[PDB]
Amino acid sequence: IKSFLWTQSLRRELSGYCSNIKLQVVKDAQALLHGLDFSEVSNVQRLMRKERRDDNDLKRLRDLNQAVNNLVELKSTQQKSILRVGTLTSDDLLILAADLEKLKSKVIRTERPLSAGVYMGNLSSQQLDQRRALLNMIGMDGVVRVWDVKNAELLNNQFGTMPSLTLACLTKQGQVDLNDAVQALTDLGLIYTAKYPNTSDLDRLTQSHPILNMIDTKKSSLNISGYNFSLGAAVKAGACMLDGGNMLETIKVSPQTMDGILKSILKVKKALGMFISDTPGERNPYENILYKICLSGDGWPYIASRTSITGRAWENTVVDLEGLTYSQLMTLKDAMLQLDPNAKTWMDIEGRPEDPVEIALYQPSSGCYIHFFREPTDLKQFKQDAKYSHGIDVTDLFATQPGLTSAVIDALPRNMVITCQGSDDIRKLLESQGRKDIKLIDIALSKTDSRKYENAVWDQYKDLCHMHTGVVVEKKKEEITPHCALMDCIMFDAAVSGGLNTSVLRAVLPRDMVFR
Ligand SMILES: O=c1ccn([C@@H]2O[C@H](COP(=O)(O)OP(=O)(O)OP(=O)(O)O)[C@@H](O)[C@H]2O)c(=O)[nH]1
Ligand SMILES: [Zn+2]
Hints:
By secondary structure, the chain is an alpha/beta fold. The protein folds into 2 domains: 343 residues, no CATH class; 173 residues, 2-Layer Sandwich (Nucleotidyltransferase, domain 5), CATH 3.30.420. The protein contains 22 helices and 14 strands. A hairpin with a 4-residue loop joins strand 8 and strand 9. Helix 20 crosses helix 21. Bound molecules: uridine 5'-triphosphate and zinc ion. Zinc ion binds next to helix 21. One of its GO terms (cellular component) is helical viral capsid. Its EC number is 3.1.13.-. Its main location: virion. One of its GO terms (molecular function) is metal ion binding.
């Protein structure tokens, strides 16, 4: 296979950074066997069998992770890394910039729908099939979601496999002696020196080593945990049982060696034409090593406990030197799948329709919202708007992502029906953007009725917009509350429905995309 060729070439080029870690991995497995509550491993295992999990299920997982991370010596530390010209060339850093940007889009498109969700209700045959095809790639009110959680950033890094845990769970849960588990994984590792073990390989191994019957081979790397017995998990643990063999799983990184490692990876990339793919789902060898090494400047990126790490690899490793990309568009198109095209949808803008600076759409029934900004072109008019309506400081918009207006409007589902307050302006912007299919309801609240819930809305949802800093005034002058497209949708809807309800809203766009 192509994939094993990349793996073997990466194994030769990085041989020097590999280490002999069997002793430590077995010591950690021994510390878990003495210290961990395996009924709580079984409890997490039950919770992962559930098609739909909540924050109560996440706490049980996070808490088990922390208890494992306390018992073990192989731990990765929070180590952010800035890459600069030197060991890496100017060209090296540009290639790495592009690859991490592509990987960013790949991982978001794979993981984010597990929590953001994909609408699967009243839709065409064509749409449902495409959506099912995406759901099958990534291991997954008519919205399909696996995690129903308040803070999705708490899923980050809680799902990784660890050889010491796999070894300790195979022993205790499998009911065999540690020696018998190491034997089995050692044998699996041996195969792994020459090929990636297939179901035919496990089947044959399991005849001499019964413990490996716990591995379900028709399973997958996705949507599972460090407590599940994937072939991926065993193959990694088996690769640690070697001491020698140039196994990638054994590599150590420090800030002393991170640049050199990446440089060697880049050598293999150029030689074999490795790439980040644009398909969500399972990672090729390169996508894998890059993701892992970038997660932390200090650790064993393949085999350490990583459950304490906050941040994404593209956040923890950055490149430095002195519209949306295709990768960003793909991300966005996928994010939009959360929308119910049949649901009540509000829209509101700040700025004139020819030059909007804040756009928002809201669907009250599910609670999802689109919110983003735009640099104004006509600065003169923006200053009057700041003073009289939105109090946004033009300098604050500098850190926003451009290109969103065209791309979001372009991807609004067909024949969708949008409610607003003063349809006149939205029509103009929708028309300027190429969407005359979108039908509008104009609601015509009076000024005083439209703002009945203004204070109610800011009280609940203030943390959802920080853009409005300026003192805003109206002539009789009196100080007023600034106008935000988002709060305006929310408050107008509450005004129509005579009441504002208490529950989380769900941001349709990743924040990693509203801002650069
Ligand atoms: O909320 C989430 C997000 C992601 N995941 C799942 O976690 C996976 C992260 O898998 P890892 O990136 O942690 O790779 P790994 O350490 O386990 O090493 P390998 O086994 O891949 O060789 C992702 O592929 C995703 O499907 C969840 O289970 N829940
Ligand atoms: Zn706002």
